[PDB]
A paper describes a structure:
[name] ([name]) is a member of the globin protein family that is expressed in the brain (∼1 µM) and the retina (∼100 µM) of vertebrates. It is involved in the protection of the nervous tissue from ischemic damage via a still-elusive biochemical mechanism. Notably, [name] is also a hexacoordinate protein in the ‘deoxy’ ferrous form, with the rate-limiting step for ligand binding being the spontaneous breakage of the distal His(E7)64–heme bond.
Crystal structures of NgbCO in the ‘dark’ state (no illumination) at 40 K and of [name]*CO obtained under continuous illumination (‘light’ state) at 15 K were determined. The partial CO occupancy is owing to the intrinsic instability of CO-bound [name] crystals, which tend to dissolve upon full ligation. We therefore avoided prolonged CO soaking, with the drawback of not achieving full ligation. In this work, we only utilized crystals with at least 90% CO ligation, as assessed by its occupancy in the determined structures [Fig. 3(a)]. The presence of photolysed CO in the protein matrix, which was not visible in the [name]*CO structure, was inferred by the full recovery of bound CO in the ‘dark’ structures collected after illumination.
Author numbering: 3 to 150
């Protein structure tokens, strides 16, 4: 797939600094949806503000995990059924911590945001469509983790 190459190429400069980029994604996420901030609790404590999440080793370690899973999707872009069961398993962990299916879109918007900003003029409408398609495939795989 030429479009798989668009994904792989677009991901290259992100993957070399996954924490800085994932930090953009999550900063965006809490700027769009501050109500997601309490879902991330460590020591039991609640982040008061979005910048508090950024000073937390556990939360930064969470970011790198997410960025690893997106990397795994990229690695497997040309089939993706090779990750299906992992992603479904990831989905039921999300159900169990109380995330809604409806939150998926804001995380995807946060990811696309982060890519557009990183790539600038290199984030062609073809690149964007390819990412939306990839993120959608990952979300449908995860959604089964609700039953599906
Ligand atoms: C529906 C929007 C989402 C919300 C609100 C959400 C929220 C969360 C929360 C609250 C956790 C647990 C945090 C913790 O206790 O440390 C988590 C874990 C995780 N998330 Fe998400 N998430 C969403 C979508 C996604 C997507 C699309 C991906 C990747 C494609 C993803 C990747 C991960 C990974 C890899 C973990 C670690 C799971 C584990 O430790 O077993 N999340 N997410």
């Amino acid at each position: 797939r030429p479009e798989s190459e668009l994904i792989r190429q677009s991901w290259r400069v992100v993957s070399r600094s996954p924490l800085e980029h994932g930090t953009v994604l999550f900063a965006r996420l809490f700027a769009l949806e501050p109500s997601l901030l309490p879902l991330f609790q460590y020591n039991g404590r609640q982040f008061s503000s979005p910048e508090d999440s950024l000073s937390s080793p556990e939360f930064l370690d969470h970011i790198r995990k997410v960025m690893l899973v997106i990397d795994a999707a990229v690695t497997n872009v040309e089939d993706l059924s090779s990750l299906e069961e992992y992603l479904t398993s990831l989905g039921r962990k999300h159900r169990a911590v109380g995330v809604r299916l409806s939150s998926f879109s804001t995380v995807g918007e946060s990811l696309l945001y982060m890519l557009e900003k990183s790539l600038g003029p290199d984030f062609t409408p073809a690149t964007r469509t390819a990412w939306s398609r990839l993120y959608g495939a990952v979300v449908q795989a995860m959604s089964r983790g609700w039953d599906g």
